Amino acid sequence: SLTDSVYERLLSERIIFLGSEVNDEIANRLCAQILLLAAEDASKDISLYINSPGGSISAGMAIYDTMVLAPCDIATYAMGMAASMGEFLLAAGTKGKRYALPHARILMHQPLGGVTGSAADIAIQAEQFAVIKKEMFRLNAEFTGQPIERIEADSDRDRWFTAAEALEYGFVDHIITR
Amino acid sequence: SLTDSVYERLLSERIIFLGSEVNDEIANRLCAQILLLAAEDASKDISLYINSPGGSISAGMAIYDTMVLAPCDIATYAMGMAASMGEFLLAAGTKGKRYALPHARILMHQPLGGVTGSAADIAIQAEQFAVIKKEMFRLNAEFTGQPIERIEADSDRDRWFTAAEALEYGFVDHIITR
Amino acid sequence: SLTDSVYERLLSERIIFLGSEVNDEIANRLCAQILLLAAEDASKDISLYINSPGGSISAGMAIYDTMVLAPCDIATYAMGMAASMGEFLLAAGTKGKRYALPHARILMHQPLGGVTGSAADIAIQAEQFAVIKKEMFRLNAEFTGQPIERIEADSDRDRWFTAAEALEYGFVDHIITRA
Amino acid sequence: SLTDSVYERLLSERIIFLGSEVNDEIANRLCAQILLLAAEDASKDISLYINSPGGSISAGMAIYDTMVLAPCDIATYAMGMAASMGEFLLAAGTKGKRYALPHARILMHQPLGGVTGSAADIAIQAEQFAVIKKEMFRLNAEFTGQPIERIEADSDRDRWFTAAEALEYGFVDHIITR
Amino acid sequence: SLTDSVYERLLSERIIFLGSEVNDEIANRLCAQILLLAAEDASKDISLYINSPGGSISAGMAIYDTMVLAPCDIATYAMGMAASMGEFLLAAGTKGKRYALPHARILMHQPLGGVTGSAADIAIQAEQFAVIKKEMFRLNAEFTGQPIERIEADSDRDRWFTAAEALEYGFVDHIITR
Amino acid sequence: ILPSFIEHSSFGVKESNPYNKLFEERIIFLGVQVDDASANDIMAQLLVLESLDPDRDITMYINSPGGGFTSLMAIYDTMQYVRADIQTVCLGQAASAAAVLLAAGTPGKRMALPNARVLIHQPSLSGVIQGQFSDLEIQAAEIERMRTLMETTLARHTGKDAGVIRKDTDRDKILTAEEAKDYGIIDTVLEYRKL
Amino acid sequence: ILPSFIEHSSFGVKESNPYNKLFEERIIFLGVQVDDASANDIMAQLLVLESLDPDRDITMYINSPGGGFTSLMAIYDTMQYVRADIQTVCLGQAASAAAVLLAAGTPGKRMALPNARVLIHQPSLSGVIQGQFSDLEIQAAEIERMRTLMETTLARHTGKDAGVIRKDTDRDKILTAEEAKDYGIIDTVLEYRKLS
Amino acid sequence: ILPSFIEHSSFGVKESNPYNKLFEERIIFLGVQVDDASANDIMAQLLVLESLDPDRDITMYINSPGGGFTSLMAIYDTMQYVRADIQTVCLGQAASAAAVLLAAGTPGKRMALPNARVLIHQPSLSGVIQGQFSDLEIQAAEIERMRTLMETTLARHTGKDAGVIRKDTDRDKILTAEEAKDYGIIDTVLEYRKLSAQTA
Amino acid sequence: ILPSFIEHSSFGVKESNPYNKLFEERIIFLGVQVDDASANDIMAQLLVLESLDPDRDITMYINSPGGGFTSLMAIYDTMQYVRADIQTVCLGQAASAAAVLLAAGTPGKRMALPNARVLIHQPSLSGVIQGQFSDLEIQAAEIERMRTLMETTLARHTGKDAGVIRKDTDRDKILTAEEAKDYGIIDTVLEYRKLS
Amino acid sequence: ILPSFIEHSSFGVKESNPYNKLFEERIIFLGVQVDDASANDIMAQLLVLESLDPDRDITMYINSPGGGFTSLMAIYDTMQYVRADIQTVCLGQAASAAAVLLAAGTPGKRMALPNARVLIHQPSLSGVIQGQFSDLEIQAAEIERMRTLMETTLARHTGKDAGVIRKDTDRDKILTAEEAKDYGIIDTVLEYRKLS
């Protein structure tokens, strides 16, 4: 399949794409690809191109953990847009090898979700939000080098970064040019 | 097909995925895969990566029985999310070889369902709920090492576990870090 | 196709699945598979794994007759769930070679259906229900070893069986196990 | 697949198409293609045929950055229609090697979009519009050679160019004929 | 794919079909095919069978320019129906090598479209209609050999031609009987 | 749009519809499909008219494509039950259930206009009743009863044999006003009274 | 379309419906399906008729395919509760819930027209109630109660044993007017009063 | 279909409904689901009845499957607020919110017909509230408040401990009229007043 | 279902609703969501009441989940504009726009029942406004104005600082009747008047 | 829900709405979107009021988000045409078409409440008009005429130059009541007239 074939050929060059909304489905494929590439050559870098509007945290953490546990380094390229989980994963790239393309946009914000059931059920959901909010912030703080308080504050509502700004905030190590 | 091809290559490495809602359809394929892998090499481990929100008990038990009856060991990895049947199946992995990825979430709760017909029909459904509730608890108790009374109590409503907490509850043997 | 490919490889190991609602479509494929396997090696067993909620009687009887007419034996495994037609087909496996997985559930009940049309048309449909109900019971009685009167009575409404109970009732010959 | 097979054969001739609305999906595939072609032969030109009504800026900037960062030159052909992002990408082709087919139409205009949410959320979106509007104009200015004030003014509403007019405006270097 | 395979085999015989509504998608594929064929053998004719109800002008002009710019000749066969853009493209075949099948019907008429937006936006659309109407008439005049005044007049509403009439009007050079 | 009008008198001045003026004259109009809702309305009108004057005749104008069997029987029982004689008049069509009703008027008093049309047929169930066989067999039984009750009660009023009705209604049976008289469904065919 | 008419008198001249005229004569019509809405209307009518004249009889005309259980009981309680005697008359069908109501008229005063039809059956739930098992077990329990309450209150009024009712209603049970009398659901079957 | 009728008197002749005749006798009917619309209608009726005669009792007939929490509280506050005593009478069902209202009548004057049914349960939200976590946390908080306010106000009227209510309502709790009386939700269970069975 | 009733007097006998009786007593009911339609109805009622008797007080009963900003301001302007004093009474909820209105009653005369609830929050736009950026920037601007106007006019009536309102409303802010009094949205919290 | 009320007098006792009472006082309410239906209702009201008393003033209360152009003009022509002076009062919003109407009241008599809002913009067509180019060109033409007619008639009533209007309305133009006065759309801004 022409698109599949094109990605395939890139895949064999150790280049993977996160080009869409982050689902369980997309996550699983990515996680499989990182597993497969590590198992092939455990020494060479993997390049993760990211152009995603964000998505499922659960699904995003699958990718993140898979990244972290990989033996080889994982280089991350922000192309076009790296939003929300997309930003998180971009910033989770191995330090020194996180790149932004010059006109890419990065979007950091706090989690969204929903609340459903009995008051008891909701009490539980809420409790979990706390846990998650906290943890996601803790990690972005770690990635960026910013203090958790600034991550909390800045993440309160949509926070946009140009490649330039993203570099100075610490989402990214370099900006690519030529 | 690029995704199929990628899973295929992992499949030949004795790696299988439970990456979605647990249907009859998904369950069957998994059961087939475990059957096929056992029949190939009955001595080598199977690795079962789980990123699932839960699903059909009936379908889940097909997977569980297939796991148990397999000659070879079945290693279970909780990645991203192992919820409900997902948690169950994770915890059902061969003891010692049950892993959680560090930012995976585990969710334990009691069965949900529906009630449909004549009062007589419903009386019957209800009777079945009793049997099933009891049994699913009995088994989670067995897997975890907890007393059935605590499994009942904790399972009453959504019960969330971090990888850390899941280790100390007994859903999982190890947490991976490397 | 990854799932197709996986089933294929199992098919060549003489393993077939009834993993869904029983339609004409699903039935036909199964029937074709049993035909093909018999034609390949007419002496070796066929293994029929069943995880189905039930389905069309017409379509189910295609599978049943195809099973019975096969030269080779047909082993049946109840996995996860064998309900209604699923239970019937399970119990229709060649005697001695009918298995249940330990946490499989078996469901026996009487036929459901529908009635429509002119009073005359309905009179006919009804007559047919009698014939079918009778026959399906006769056969489950034969499979299980129970008396038709008990099959009628127990089948009146949803009747649930654990692997254990299914063994004693006669749907199944063995329960499988390891450790 | 007959269409896939036909594009494939062109792809191996270093010819790519932007023949539709510019999505994340279309953008990613184009970016992959430019990546793959550069990696194959880093010296030979790439020909980018454009017949598009426009699309996502984010997605378009992925293509644009991917174009700029490519080692090899990127020739751009406007066929049938190059509108909005389509025009932008056309005009972004490497200087000297930007072509229009004689009856192609070029359309330049300012960004469109949407506003939703809380007044605070909207304040933010608005801020972003300013940034983006500015930048897109800056770039079109650069491409065309026009002053940013004229790009602003002319872009205020739909601005239609024949091949002839586009040449004199500076979207394009040549018009092709025989 | 049986249909794909059949067209493929014809494609290798330098035979192409315009067998539907003229979209960006269809146009692109045709343009690619003409490009590919020219690049294969730049001397041999291409045969363009047309059975189309018409379509997008923009898209049609992509095909037209691609036809004109091709090194080789382009023979056009009107089969069943050549309407609107379909008639235009038929008539745009290289002079002398434009054919009608004996019971084919040809339909000439003026452009259809739509108007929306602010009064200012509409003013612009309208201006553009003028430009386009004029040029499409100019070109049909050129193809047929008729005066633009008659093309304008005849095109005002649906104008139907039998193969016979189409020959005398100048849409077509020959009628095929054999 | 259905006009109303006013009636002069020495006593006072009253507003009424055609349907009300009709009812004032002991005429009940059966024009819709005999759904459970409409049937109650008919029964109530019947019962009320009896209560208002038990000796005077009630007349029932029928132009109905038919309707529910359960309703048919309820209306019928009410028609027969009230003290007053019932005069049935088919104006356009009396189909299905409506046919039985037409037929069920008091003997001597069943009529139709000349190009009226009477259609009889056995009970159908369009749409499907779903269920366990045990439930469906009970249902089927109840439907055979319903069928034979239609045949019984038509037989009673037409002077035909129940078995003959069953034969004639196995399939649809269309009757002109004349034919309907012959069949024993109406007594007389109205002739026009024009001057 | 339901006509209205006018009634002469020396006192004045009044406009009324058939349904109103029926109500003026202490007759309440139970013709729709017994939804929560209709039930309130029936109760209110009952309560009002009692308030207007507690000694005189209330009559209840029944042609209903049945209805909600929660509503059934409420209507029932109101029927029994008011000071006045209740006369129940099945015209057409008294099915499901409507059957119990028919049965629940004051003894001696329960009637049906001859081709009337009474159907009894146990409570069904078409549509599905979704939930955690804990919730569903509570629900199921409540439904068993509801069921056995239907059987209790029929048993009370029919003179039958509760367990017998349960046997007979396990599946649908259809009764002719005669059969219904035998069963103890009605007291008398109305004979036609035609003068001819 | 709901009939109207006419009432004779030496003063004049008036047309009314059952619902109007009921209201004329200071009876307010609570029969729908307690949506924001219906609640206003109930409050207005209560307020008006008070304004018409502050000393005489208001009776509230209840057969309601329940309803909105925000509405529940408004109705409640109005019930308690007006000068007049409130008599609550459960005719069929008083579920959810309707249960609290039933319970919230003036002590001594809370009733139910014998096969009436009272159901209490904690507040649910069917359907989903979507949002940023910050918004949701606020929401959740407000819901815990709403929950504990239901428990408080039931406790007040039943004589039970708030914590006990919470336990008993964690899941659905169904009460017969008798059970409801025991629970302290109604005071008396109405016995039938039929004149014929009065010989017992 | 909303009953009507009749009022005796030596002058004559009149029919009315609860809502009409309420209006007769200079009470306007604000119970729906403040859509453009309803707002006109409120303004008209206010204007009419002033015209009927400019010295006597108008009272506004509020149980509303909120509503349109353009409407909020119109109603507000009208409330303030009429000669008569405005008494605001929150009965259940006064959310969003309704809150501002509650607050905007004449000082001294703003009330709530004890379990009433007041919610304030900044203006949202669910649903999307589509457009060219030039059009959207104009729009956004107008929304910032609208926001700061809400904050101004609350500040005016609560005695709080505009900037403080903005901080407090950045996210949703829920107030009990007591809290609402503290916040300066209402003056008094009504105590029950039960004779017992 | 919109209450009605009754008016005492020595002559007799009459029932009315707020909207009727308003109309009784020669006030026409323009509150919906100016669709073809509503426009006819406004014209008829205007015409009827003139017929009833041609010397006394008619007042028009405006809170409208705008509406159809063809309707705008009709209403406008009728406003200007009738003998009586027209007083226009913007209560909330007067947007689009409504803005022109507000402006088109008789000079001296055009008003707004202080937080009222006036929005002007050129004619839009959301939704698409489909057609042959010949048809579309005729259409486009007519729409330029319609546009320039809006600009002419505003110019007439604001004292501004038509070309200036065009420039100012090329994009949306939002006006506070004060700004609207400066722009020449209203004459005075109503001050609140409350006793405290």
Q: What does this protein look like?
A:
The PDB classes it as hydrolase. The structure is cut from a larger assembly and holds 5 copies of chain A and 5 copies of chain F. Chain A is an alpha/beta fold and 178 residues long. Helix content of chain A is 49%, strand content 21%. In chain A, strands 1, 2, 3, 4, 5, 7 and 8 form a 7-stranded mixed sheet that branches. In chain A, strand 1, helix 2 (24-40) and strand 2 (46-52) form a beta-alpha-beta unit. Chain A is globular. The two termini of chain A are 32 Å apart. Chain F is α/β, with parallel strands linked by helices and 195 residues long. In chain F, strands 3, 4, 5, 6, 7, 9 and 10 form a 7-stranded mixed sheet that branches. In chain F, strands 1-2 form a two-stranded antiparallel ribbon. In chain F, helix 5 (133-158) packs across helix 6 (162-169). Chain F is globular. At the F-G interface, helix 1, helix 2, helix 3 and helix 5 of F face helix 1 and strand 5 of G. Strand 6 (112-118) of chain D pairs antiparallel with strand 8 of chain I, so a sheet runs across the interface.
Give a brief rundown of this model.
Chain A is an alpha/beta fold. Chain A has helices spanning 2-11, 24-40, 57-69, 85-91, 119-144, 148-154, 163-169; strands spanning 15-18, 46-52, 74-83, 98-100, 105-108, 112-115, 159-162, 174-175. In chain A, strands 1, 2, 3, 4, 5, 7 and 8 form a 7-stranded mixed sheet that branches.
